PDB file of C-alpha atoms and ligand atoms in Angstrom:
ATOM      1  CA  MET A   1      -0.019  -0.067  -0.050  1.00  0.00           C
ATOM      2  CA  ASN A   2       0.906   3.709  -0.476  1.00  0.00           C
ATOM      3  CA  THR A   3       0.529   5.946   2.502  1.00  0.00           C
ATOM      4  CA  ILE A   4       1.091   9.622   2.383  1.00  0.00           C
ATOM      5  CA  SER A   5       1.730  11.275   5.576  1.00  0.00           C
ATOM      6  CA  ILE A   6       3.526  14.188   7.366  1.00  0.00           C
ATOM      7  CA  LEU A   7       7.425  13.985   7.260  1.00  0.00           C
ATOM      8  CA  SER A   8       8.568  14.290  10.945  1.00  0.00           C
ATOM      9  CA  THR A   9      11.906  14.517  12.720  1.00  0.00           C
ATOM     10  CA  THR A  10      12.176  10.706  12.796  1.00  0.00           C
ATOM     11  CA  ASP A  11      11.763  10.352   9.000  1.00  0.00           C
ATOM     12  CA  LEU A  12      14.409  12.746   8.194  1.00  0.00           C
ATOM     13  CA  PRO A  13      17.604  10.343   7.902  1.00  0.00           C
ATOM     14  CA  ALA A  14      15.730   8.247   5.451  1.00  0.00           C
ATOM     15  CA  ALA A  15      14.651  11.367   3.357  1.00  0.00           C
ATOM     16  CA  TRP A  16      18.192  12.575   3.374  1.00  0.00           C
ATOM     17  CA  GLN A  17      19.120   9.141   1.750  1.00  0.00           C
ATOM     18  CA  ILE A  18      16.541   9.664  -0.896  1.00  0.00           C
ATOM     19  CA  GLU A  19      17.654  13.226  -1.479  1.00  0.00           C
ATOM     20  CA  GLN A  20      21.287  12.103  -1.959  1.00  0.00           C
ATOM     21  CA  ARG A  21      20.420   9.277  -4.469  1.00  0.00           C
ATOM     22  CA  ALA A  22      17.602  10.961  -6.476  1.00  0.00           C
ATOM     23  CA  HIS A  23      18.971  14.576  -6.919  1.00  0.00           C
ATOM     24  CA  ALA A  24      21.652  15.036  -9.714  1.00  0.00           C
ATOM     25  CA  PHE A  25      22.667  18.344  -7.756  1.00  0.00           C
ATOM     26  CA  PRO A  26      21.778  17.271  -4.018  1.00  0.00           C
ATOM     27  CA  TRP A  27      21.230  19.880  -1.305  1.00  0.00           C
ATOM     28  CA  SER A  28      23.880  20.147   1.376  1.00  0.00           C
ATOM     29  CA  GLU A  29      22.821  18.432   4.684  1.00  0.00           C
ATOM     30  CA  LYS A  30      22.551  21.644   6.642  1.00  0.00           C
ATOM     31  CA  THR A  31      20.071  23.030   3.984  1.00  0.00           C
ATOM     32  CA  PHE A  32      18.157  19.893   4.097  1.00  0.00           C
ATOM     33  CA  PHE A  33      17.818  19.518   7.760  1.00  0.00           C
ATOM     34  CA  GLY A  34      16.910  23.345   7.910  1.00  0.00           C
ATOM     35  CA  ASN A  35      13.789  23.141   5.792  1.00  0.00           C
ATOM     36  CA  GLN A  36      11.627  21.817   8.590  1.00  0.00           C
ATOM     37  CA  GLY A  37       9.159  23.265  11.058  1.00  0.00           C
ATOM     38  CA  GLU A  38       7.378  26.715  11.132  1.00  0.00           C
ATOM     39  CA  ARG A  39       5.331  27.086   8.059  1.00  0.00           C
ATOM     40  CA  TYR A  40       6.588  23.887   6.448  1.00  0.00           C
ATOM     41  CA  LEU A  41       3.977  21.318   5.183  1.00  0.00           C
ATOM     42  CA  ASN A  42       6.374  18.459   4.603  1.00  0.00           C
ATOM     43  CA  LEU A  43       5.161  14.939   3.202  1.00  0.00           C
ATOM     44  CA  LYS A  44       6.486  11.448   2.689  1.00  0.00           C
ATOM     45  CA  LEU A  45       5.123   8.600   0.649  1.00  0.00           C
ATOM     46  CA  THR A  46       5.621   5.190   2.271  1.00  0.00           C
ATOM     47  CA  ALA A  47       5.376   2.216  -0.214  1.00  0.00           C
ATOM     48  CA  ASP A  48       4.902  -0.901   1.898  1.00  0.00           C
ATOM     49  CA  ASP A  49       6.897  -0.184   4.963  1.00  0.00           C
ATOM     50  CA  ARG A  50       9.557   1.759   3.117  1.00  0.00           C
ATOM     51  CA  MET A  51       9.864   5.479   2.410  1.00  0.00           C
ATOM     52  CA  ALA A  52       9.424   5.911  -1.318  1.00  0.00           C
ATOM     53  CA  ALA A  53       9.317   9.587  -1.703  1.00  0.00           C
ATOM     54  CA  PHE A  54       9.250  12.991   0.198  1.00  0.00           C
ATOM     55  CA  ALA A  55       8.199  16.673  -0.566  1.00  0.00           C
ATOM     56  CA  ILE A  56       9.370  19.888   1.020  1.00  0.00           C
ATOM     57  CA  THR A  57       6.813  22.886   0.867  1.00  0.00           C
ATOM     58  CA  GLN A  58       6.341  26.074   2.604  1.00  0.00           C
ATOM     59  CA  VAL A  59       3.199  28.168   3.088  1.00  0.00           C
ATOM     60  CA  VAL A  60       3.122  31.817   3.228  1.00  0.00           C
ATOM     61  CA  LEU A  61      -0.195  33.633   3.104  1.00  0.00           C
ATOM     62  CA  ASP A  62      -2.365  31.834   0.355  1.00  0.00           C
ATOM     63  CA  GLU A  63       0.686  30.708  -1.787  1.00  0.00           C
ATOM     64  CA  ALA A  64       3.187  28.094  -1.254  1.00  0.00           C
ATOM     65  CA  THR A  65       6.459  26.873  -2.800  1.00  0.00           C
ATOM     66  CA  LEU A  66       7.569  23.234  -3.501  1.00  0.00           C
ATOM     67  CA  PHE A  67      11.127  23.412  -2.704  1.00  0.00           C
ATOM     68  CA  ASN A  68      11.824  19.769  -3.054  1.00  0.00           C
ATOM     69  CA  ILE A  69      10.112  16.655  -4.282  1.00  0.00           C
ATOM     70  CA  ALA A  70      12.143  13.342  -4.736  1.00  0.00           C
ATOM     71  CA  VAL A  71      11.279   9.672  -5.409  1.00  0.00           C
ATOM     72  CA  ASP A  72      13.948   7.134  -4.562  1.00  0.00           C
ATOM     73  CA  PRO A  73      15.478   5.656  -7.727  1.00  0.00           C
ATOM     74  CA  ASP A  74      14.024   2.090  -6.729  1.00  0.00           C
ATOM     75  CA  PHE A  75      10.565   3.624  -6.882  1.00  0.00           C
ATOM     76  CA  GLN A  76      10.664   6.033  -9.895  1.00  0.00           C
ATOM     77  CA  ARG A  77       8.607   5.710 -12.946  1.00  0.00           C
ATOM     78  CA  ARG A  78       5.947   3.893 -10.827  1.00  0.00           C
ATOM     79  CA  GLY A  79       3.506   6.960 -10.464  1.00  0.00           C
ATOM     80  CA  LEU A  80       4.420   7.837  -6.934  1.00  0.00           C
ATOM     81  CA  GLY A  81       5.741  11.310  -7.623  1.00  0.00           C
ATOM     82  CA  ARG A  82       2.491  12.230  -9.097  1.00  0.00           C
ATOM     83  CA  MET A  83       0.366  10.717  -6.239  1.00  0.00           C
ATOM     84  CA  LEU A  84       2.438  12.501  -3.613  1.00  0.00           C
ATOM     85  CA  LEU A  85       2.154  15.849  -5.485  1.00  0.00           C
ATOM     86  CA  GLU A  86      -1.601  15.201  -5.910  1.00  0.00           C
ATOM     87  CA  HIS A  87      -2.033  14.630  -2.227  1.00  0.00           C
ATOM     88  CA  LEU A  88      -0.168  17.813  -1.552  1.00  0.00           C
ATOM     89  CA  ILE A  89      -2.129  19.872  -3.947  1.00  0.00           C
ATOM     90  CA  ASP A  90      -5.322  18.567  -2.220  1.00  0.00           C
ATOM     91  CA  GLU A  91      -3.882  19.539   1.200  1.00  0.00           C
ATOM     92  CA  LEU A  92      -2.974  22.956  -0.035  1.00  0.00           C
ATOM     93  CA  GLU A  93      -6.429  23.624  -1.359  1.00  0.00           C
ATOM     94  CA  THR A  94      -8.037  22.855   2.048  1.00  0.00           C
ATOM     95  CA  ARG A  95      -5.509  25.413   3.517  1.00  0.00           C
ATOM     96  CA  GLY A  96      -6.762  28.247   1.138  1.00  0.00           C
ATOM     97  CA  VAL A  97      -3.683  28.066  -1.094  1.00  0.00           C
ATOM     98  CA  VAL A  98      -4.142  29.429  -4.526  1.00  0.00           C
ATOM     99  CA  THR A  99      -0.911  29.034  -6.261  1.00  0.00           C
ATOM    100  CA  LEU A 100       2.042  26.427  -5.860  1.00  0.00           C
ATOM    101  CA  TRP A 101       5.356  27.746  -7.122  1.00  0.00           C
ATOM    102  CA  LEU A 102       8.607  25.860  -7.818  1.00  0.00           C
ATOM    103  CA  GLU A 103      11.815  26.200  -9.747  1.00  0.00           C
ATOM    104  CA  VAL A 104      13.318  23.429 -11.695  1.00  0.00           C
ATOM    105  CA  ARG A 105      16.511  22.876 -13.884  1.00  0.00           C
ATOM    106  CA  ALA A 106      15.733  23.459 -17.573  1.00  0.00           C
ATOM    107  CA  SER A 107      17.297  20.026 -18.339  1.00  0.00           C
ATOM    108  CA  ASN A 108      15.322  17.965 -15.698  1.00  0.00           C
ATOM    109  CA  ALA A 109      13.067  16.383 -18.298  1.00  0.00           C
ATOM    110  CA  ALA A 110      11.338  14.192 -15.879  1.00  0.00           C
ATOM    111  CA  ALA A 111      10.498  16.781 -13.382  1.00  0.00           C
ATOM    112  CA  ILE A 112       9.170  19.242 -16.062  1.00  0.00           C
ATOM    113  CA  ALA A 113       6.966  16.515 -17.415  1.00  0.00           C
ATOM    114  CA  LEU A 114       5.425  15.772 -14.118  1.00  0.00           C
ATOM    115  CA  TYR A 115       4.791  19.350 -13.380  1.00  0.00           C
ATOM    116  CA  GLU A 116       3.393  20.210 -16.829  1.00  0.00           C
ATOM    117  CA  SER A 117       1.272  17.021 -16.569  1.00  0.00           C
ATOM    118  CA  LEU A 118      -0.243  18.430 -13.356  1.00  0.00           C
ATOM    119  CA  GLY A 119      -0.984  21.807 -14.811  1.00  0.00           C
ATOM    120  CA  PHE A 120       2.113  23.821 -13.801  1.00  0.00           C
ATOM    121  CA  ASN A 121       2.569  26.899 -16.187  1.00  0.00           C
ATOM    122  CA  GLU A 122       6.181  28.218 -16.988  1.00  0.00           C
ATOM    123  CA  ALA A 123       6.199  31.745 -15.362  1.00  0.00           C
ATOM    124  CA  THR A 124       9.657  33.060 -15.623  1.00  0.00           C
ATOM    125  CA  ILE A 125      13.136  32.019 -16.624  1.00  0.00           C
ATOM    126  CA  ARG A 126      16.190  32.743 -14.561  1.00  0.00           C
ATOM    127  CA  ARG A 127      19.116  32.395 -17.060  1.00  0.00           C
ATOM    128  CA  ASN A 128      22.136  30.481 -15.791  1.00  0.00           C
ATOM    129  CA  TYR A 129      20.839  30.427 -12.301  1.00  0.00           C
ATOM    130  CA  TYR A 130      21.901  26.783 -11.754  1.00  0.00           C
ATOM    131  CA  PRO A 131      25.635  25.376 -11.573  1.00  0.00           C
ATOM    132  CA  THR A 132      26.417  22.321 -13.688  1.00  0.00           C
ATOM    133  CA  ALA A 133      29.458  20.115 -13.932  1.00  0.00           C
ATOM    134  CA  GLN A 134      30.895  22.332 -16.723  1.00  0.00           C
ATOM    135  CA  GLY A 135      28.889  25.590 -16.831  1.00  0.00           C
ATOM    136  CA  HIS A 136      25.379  26.767 -16.007  1.00  0.00           C
ATOM    137  CA  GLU A 137      21.812  25.911 -16.757  1.00  0.00           C
ATOM    138  CA  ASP A 138      18.711  28.066 -16.545  1.00  0.00           C
ATOM    139  CA  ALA A 139      15.989  27.688 -13.860  1.00  0.00           C
ATOM    140  CA  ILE A 140      12.489  27.542 -14.987  1.00  0.00           C
ATOM    141  CA  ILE A 141       9.979  29.204 -12.448  1.00  0.00           C
ATOM    142  CA  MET A 142       6.679  27.389 -12.650  1.00  0.00           C
ATOM    143  CA  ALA A 143       3.222  28.280 -11.111  1.00  0.00           C
ATOM    144  CA  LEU A 144       0.249  25.947 -10.581  1.00  0.00           C
ATOM    145  CA  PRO A 145      -3.083  27.679  -9.941  1.00  0.00           C
ATOM    146  CA  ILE A 146      -5.154  25.647  -7.447  1.00  0.00           C
ATOM    147  CA  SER A 147      -8.932  26.314  -7.812  1.00  0.00           C
ATOM    148  CA  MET A 148     -11.110  26.688  -4.766  1.00  0.00           C
ATOM    149  CA  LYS A 149     -13.369  23.799  -3.867  1.00  0.00           C
ATOM    150  CA  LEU A 150     -16.345  23.585  -1.435  1.00  0.00           C
ATOM    151  CA  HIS A 151     -15.628  21.967   1.995  1.00  0.00           C
TER     152      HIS A 151
HETATM  153  C1  ACO B 201      11.055  21.637  -7.147  1.00  0.00           C
HETATM  154  C2  ACO B 201      11.958  20.500  -7.323  1.00  0.00           C
HETATM  155  O1  ACO B 201      12.233  19.809  -6.370  1.00  0.00           O
HETATM  156  S1  ACO B 201      12.789  20.278  -8.689  1.00  0.00           S
HETATM  157  C3  ACO B 201      13.678  18.636  -8.356  1.00  0.00           C
HETATM  158  C4  ACO B 201      12.921  17.426  -8.707  1.00  0.00           C
HETATM  159  N1  ACO B 201      13.207  16.184  -8.333  1.00  0.00           N
HETATM  160  C5  ACO B 201      14.366  15.589  -8.754  1.00  0.00           C
HETATM  161  O2  ACO B 201      14.925  16.128  -9.869  1.00  0.00           O
HETATM  162  C6  ACO B 201      14.901  14.433  -8.125  1.00  0.00           C
HETATM  163  C7  ACO B 201      15.140  13.249  -9.128  1.00  0.00           C
HETATM  164  N2  ACO B 201      13.973  12.755  -9.852  1.00  0.00           N
HETATM  165  C8  ACO B 201      12.806  12.191  -9.072  1.00  0.00           C
HETATM  166  O3  ACO B 201      12.874  12.072  -7.888  1.00  0.00           O
HETATM  167  C9  ACO B 201      11.724  11.726  -9.824  1.00  0.00           C
HETATM  168  O4  ACO B 201      12.117  11.438 -11.017  1.00  0.00           O
HETATM  169  C10 ACO B 201      10.431  12.672  -9.978  1.00  0.00           C
HETATM  170  C11 ACO B 201      10.156  13.395  -8.550  1.00  0.00           C
HETATM  171  C12 ACO B 201      10.765  13.826 -10.857  1.00  0.00           C
HETATM  172  C13 ACO B 201       9.214  11.958 -10.544  1.00  0.00           C
HETATM  173  O5  ACO B 201       8.734  11.040  -9.872  1.00  0.00           O
HETATM  174  P1  ACO B 201       8.306   9.747 -10.623  1.00  0.00           P
HETATM  175  O6  ACO B 201       7.749   9.033  -9.491  1.00  0.00           O
HETATM  176  O7  ACO B 201       9.358   9.277 -11.095  1.00  0.00           O
HETATM  177  O8  ACO B 201       7.317  10.207 -11.356  1.00  0.00           O
HETATM  178  P2  ACO B 201       6.048   9.462 -11.750  1.00  0.00           P
HETATM  179  O9  ACO B 201       6.223   8.176 -11.981  1.00  0.00           O
HETATM  180  O10 ACO B 201       4.870   9.921 -11.111  1.00  0.00           O
HETATM  181  O11 ACO B 201       5.731   9.993 -13.089  1.00  0.00           O
HETATM  182  C14 ACO B 201       5.377  11.082 -13.245  1.00  0.00           C
HETATM  183  C15 ACO B 201       5.462  11.593 -14.578  1.00  0.00           C
HETATM  184  O12 ACO B 201       6.644  12.226 -14.978  1.00  0.00           O
HETATM  185  C16 ACO B 201       6.862  12.028 -16.312  1.00  0.00           C
HETATM  186  N3  ACO B 201       8.159  11.473 -16.169  1.00  0.00           N
HETATM  187  C17 ACO B 201       8.559  10.960 -15.023  1.00  0.00           C
HETATM  188  N4  ACO B 201       9.668  10.333 -15.124  1.00  0.00           N
HETATM  189  C18 ACO B 201      10.053  10.641 -16.313  1.00  0.00           C
HETATM  190  C19 ACO B 201      11.313  10.235 -17.166  1.00  0.00           C
HETATM  191  N5  ACO B 201      12.275   9.776 -16.467  1.00  0.00           N
HETATM  192  N6  ACO B 201      11.320  10.777 -18.309  1.00  0.00           N
HETATM  193  C20 ACO B 201      10.260  11.342 -18.939  1.00  0.00           C
HETATM  194  N7  ACO B 201       9.239  11.527 -18.148  1.00  0.00           N
HETATM  195  C21 ACO B 201       9.001  11.251 -17.020  1.00  0.00           C
HETATM  196  C22 ACO B 201       5.730  11.482 -16.918  1.00  0.00           C
HETATM  197  O13 ACO B 201       4.849  12.366 -17.277  1.00  0.00           O
HETATM  198  C23 ACO B 201       5.259  10.667 -15.763  1.00  0.00           C
HETATM  199  O14 ACO B 201       3.829  10.631 -16.125  1.00  0.00           O
HETATM  200  P3  ACO B 201       2.963   9.840 -16.982  1.00  0.00           P
HETATM  201  O15 ACO B 201       2.164   8.970 -15.979  1.00  0.00           O
HETATM  202  O16 ACO B 201       2.319  10.943 -17.608  1.00  0.00           O
HETATM  203  O17 ACO B 201       3.617   8.991 -17.912  1.00  0.00           O
END
């Protein structure tokens, strides 16, 4: 079974393992352990007693930023990234959040396709914002409008 839940202190070591195997340009550890607590809505997805994925999000006013989503390589291309994001989007809506923002590497083909498929729109481009092995890469800033439901 696939269980989506709040990512809490105890979950962080396993999440850091996912961060390090999934991200082609991983955060540092200090940054990773710093994106928790006040105004963070952080989620994990548990596939049969193993963490499969996590997502780091911050809520300010009626907007939010997805700072990070990652599915462990063992669990990728199985639909779990989408399911985790979908559950986050639902939760944001119940919190009154009208827009989810993110930035992504222009070459992260897989991430962009997930986002586009969920209805993210390119908003703005930051040229050569991301460091690579040899030079730089653009950052694509994307926004997802989340329309209001009845409760
Ligand atoms: C704001 C940020 O965090 S940007 C950083 C994003 N995270 C990373 O780059 C970490 C490394 N990558 C990952 O962890 C995963 O690849 C994720 C998060 C991008 C996607 O998770 P997955 O679970 O693999 O994706 P999932 O299976 O749900 O598939 C989602 C969709 O993405 C697309 N997609 C996913 N992987 C790929 C791929 N490798 N190539 C092309 N398209 C892909 C497809 O649209 C797929 O949807 P489909 O059902 O329409 O065929």
